[PDB]
């Protein structure tokens, strides 16, 4: 049961993660603008959202198949997969928040986005 997350899913997951992690209001407003400071509050927020999107498991780490489904946005699955796998590492400091964010950073660096406009004809 993997389905891709939309904008609406992300807004929901954001609300859930904000409240469950008691995110201060300064951060909330940044996260609504998709602005992510590299600090521990943000790293657990990102883990939390990825968990809910089924992109990240705290034990297994980044979930490649689901990430490929989410991040392809119509692109060649095989090519998106090889890029994703370059972003996948091990839980070196045993901190799943740090682990999720590291993946996030690599994705953004490689221009893989969770959400992308879709044109349909």
Author numbering: 2 to 122
Publication excerpt:
AeOBP22 is unusual in that it is expressed in multiple chemosensory tissues, including in the antenna, the proboscis of the females, the thoracic spiracles, in the male reproductive glands where it is transferred to the females during mating, and in the salivary glands.
The second crystal form was solved in the P31 space group and contains nine molecules in the asymmetric unit arranged in a pseudo three-fold arrangement of “trimers” consisting of domain swapped dimer and a separately packed monomer. Ligands are observed bound at the center of each monomer with residues 112–121 forming an α-helix that forms one edge of the ligand-binding pocket. Saturated C16 binds weakly with KD ~690 nM, however, introduction of a single degree of unsaturation at the Δ9 position (C16:1) leads to an approximate four-fold increase in the binding affinity (KD = 175 ± 41 nM). Therefore, we conclude that the domain swapped dimers are an artifact of the crystallization process, and further discussions below are confined to the structures of the monomeric forms.
